[PDB]
From Swiss-Prot, chains A, B:
It is found in: Virion. Homododecamer. Interacts with the terminase large subunit; this interaction allows the packaging of viral DNA. Interacts (via C-terminus) with the head-to-tail adapter protein gp4; this interaction participates in the head completion. Interacts with the scaffolding protein; this interaction initiates procapsid assembly, thereby ensuring incorporation of only one portal ring per capsid. Interacts with the capsid protein. Forms the portal vertex of the capsid. This portal plays critical roles in head assembly, genome packaging, neck/tail attachment, and genome ejection. Procapsid assembly may initiate with a nucleation complex composed of portal and scaffolding proteins. The portal protein multimerizes as a single ring-shaped homododecamer arranged around a central channel. Switches upon genome packaging from an asymmetrical conformation in the procapsid (PC-portal) to a symmetrical ring in the mature capsid (MV-portal). This change of conformation may serve as a signal for headful packaging. This is Portal protein. Belongs to the p22likevirus portal protein family. It comes from Salmonella phage P22.
From Swiss-Prot, chains C, D, E, F:
The N-terminus changes its conformation when transitioning from the preassembly state to the postassembly state. It comes from Salmonella phage P22. Transmembrane segments: none annotated. One of its GO terms (cellular component) is virus tail. Keywords: Degradation of host cell envelope components during virus entry, Degradation of host peptidoglycans during virus entry, Hydrolase, Late protein, Lyase, Viral genome ejection through host cell envelope, Viral penetration into host cytoplasm, Viral short tail ejection system, Virion, Virus entry into host cell. Monomer; homododecamer upon binding to the portal ring. Interacts (via C-terminus) with the portal protein; this interaction participates in the head completion. Interacts with the Tail hub protein gp10. Interacts with the tail needle protein gp26. The gene is 4. Tail protein that binds the portal ring and functions as a head completion protein. 12 copies of gp4 form a structural ring at the bottom of the portal ring. Together with gp10 and gp26, gp4 is required for stabilization of the condensed DNA within the capsid; perhaps by plugging the hole through which the DNA enters. Plays a role in ejection of the bacteriophage DNA into the host cell at the initiation of infection. Functions as an exolysin that catalyzes the cleavage of the glycosidic bonds between N-acetylmuramic acid and N-acetylglucosamine residues in peptidoglycans. GO terms for biological process: symbiont entry into host cell via disruption of host cell envelope; symbiont entry into host cell via disruption of host cell wall peptidoglycan; symbiont genome ejection through host cell envelope, short tail mechanism. InterPro entries: Gp4_sf, Tail_accessory_Gp4. GO terms for molecular function: hydrolase activity. Its main location: virion. It is found in: Virion. This is Head-to-tail adapter protein gp4.
Amino acid sequence: FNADIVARTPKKKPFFWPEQIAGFEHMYDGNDDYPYYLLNRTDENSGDLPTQPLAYYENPEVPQANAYMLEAATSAVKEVATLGVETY
Amino acid sequence: FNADIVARTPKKKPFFWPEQIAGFEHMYDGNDDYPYYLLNRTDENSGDLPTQPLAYYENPEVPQANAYMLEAATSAVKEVATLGVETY
Amino acid sequence: MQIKTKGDLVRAALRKLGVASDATLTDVEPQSMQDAVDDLEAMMAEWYQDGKGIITGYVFSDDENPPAEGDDHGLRSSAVSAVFHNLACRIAPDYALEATAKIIATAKYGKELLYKQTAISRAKRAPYPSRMPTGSGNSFANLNEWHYFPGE
Amino acid sequence: MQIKTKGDLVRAALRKLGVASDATLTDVEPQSMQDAVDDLEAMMAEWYQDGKGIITGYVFSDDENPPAEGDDHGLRSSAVSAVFHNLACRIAPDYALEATAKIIATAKYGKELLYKQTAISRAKRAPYPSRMPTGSGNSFANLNEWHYFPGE
Amino acid sequence: MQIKTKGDLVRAALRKLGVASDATLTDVEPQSMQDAVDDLEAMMAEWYQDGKGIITGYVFSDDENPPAEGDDHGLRSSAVSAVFHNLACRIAPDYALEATAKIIATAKYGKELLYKQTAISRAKRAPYPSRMPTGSGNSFANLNEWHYFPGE
Amino acid sequence: MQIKTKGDLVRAALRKLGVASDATLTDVEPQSMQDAVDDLEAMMAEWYQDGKGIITGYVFSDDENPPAEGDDHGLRSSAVSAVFHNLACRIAPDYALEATAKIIATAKYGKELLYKQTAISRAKRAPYPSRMPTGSGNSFANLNEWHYFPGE
């Protein structure tokens, strides 16, 4: 299950309105040719673009239940897979 | 019981209004072909979409009662399953 | 349904706005009805972004057929209310009017319900990445040399 | 119940709005009643999203039968109040009116109660995943080589 | 669509503002229509920043052809509505007016939908940096001495 | 574009303010046009801070040529709207007026779009510092005794 979390889960990337980065889309593709990132500010109908702190997709995380149960199952198999104390 | 928590529990995914990601649904399916995620901003009736911080489904967690009771039961069986001190 | 044509939707919207109805004594000029039909067609084209927007079954009239009013809209029964409520909201500014709050709320609710099923159908999970192993548990895949997922 | 037809629902909605009643001296034109029935049918079609929405037992009239008013709605006893309150709220804008706060509150409460039982019935837990073992405690399944849950 | 020329867009905007229509008794002077067409051309030039702005298929008329009104705009069916809505918001100050809230909301929504597809198409990930190795897993690249990504 | 001269920009600004137009019955005195042209020249000089400000291609008239009105402004097609909207905003106080909210919003948006491309072009990363080594990986530079970056 945990492996499925690593592969099929969206990565951590910013959430953008299309109008926020209109015309600056080449600044966010991953290159390092610019000293900063530019954002559009004005709108011809709303006057100014609304203010909202940038939100990023959360990083994938292994649930506490998964880790706890994996550790518990491994410990159980370790404890039960002891023949005798030795195969006398 | 803990195993039932691991398997039959919805995992951590964002909560979205259908209109927030209308037309951008292929951006959230899990691929890594985009530098960011785009969200719809405007509504033709409400003017602008309401602002609300993104909510994620909580990760599955083993309750403190379950872990405490598993440890207590294991300790009780460990202590009571001692013949004598030796089988004299 | 009794609303089976584009003009029926236009009359329903006008009745919603109180501009005209089959009960009133003065009905709008047929040019106003043609303008409302044009507004409905433009709105439906805007919603249906060449198949990447809201799917409704609307049938777009052709230029060869003279009357735009009179052709069946092709909408399902559950879509008529949202369509004509949004049409009333859109054509209210023509008559120096403003649709009441109930009409706006109904239009929002109807558009959300219109896109609900399409949004459900479009919530598809992407396939496994091309660099992800299938695992030794998949005996059939591993015996046929399918160690990694195809992807795409 | 004394409300057994679509027209009975329309009359109850009109009475709730104070527009027309069996006690007033001026009643609406039958065309207004037909328009209200059309609005009721559109609202019911919107609610009943081809079986994936609010289930109420409402019977949709067919085009072959001439009078849409006169057929039994088929609603339950507990659904009539919500239906006609929502209908009054929806048809208020026709007469340049706005339903009072009590009518809107009753409509909200009635719609919630309408969907309550269906929401209870639709809260079904998904089966065990296909990769989840049954466990050795399930002796019957383990003896019959059912070491893993089927899934789907 | 019935809106096939720039003048059709201008008339739609004027009808939206309530300034003039085919139903009213007084229409604007043709000079007003020419001014509106000039405003539409300026707005389209501003949006289409020489190919780096909003792509819509709009065709810019030349000075050689005398009548600017009469040439097809070249817009797609889904792009028309937004256009004239925005046009209304840009020509309301000429007649000492102010477009109502619905027109402004529709203009915002239409512009967003206009740029949605171009924004999707422009969300391209940059290639690997020139200093990033390909890895030994890429047997084909490693055998052909392609140990590092090209870049650019 | 039909706006090809400074006077065309002034006339567009005056039309946007509702002060004068080719449709009105009273047009401003030519001295008012000259004053508006002077304001436009001052605003363009302020924007174009001797090449360190907003680059637009505007051509500044010389004192030798008598008529300041009549010369082509030299602006691009995408710059005309922003220029004349800002001009209308700037010359509104002359006639005891105040530009409406839409005009100010359009002026802000147009100025932002005007400076967008120049801002993109001016986001240049500084070279490596003079004290930064090139590294042994750069075999060509190391063999030619270029152990450190030049700088400046």
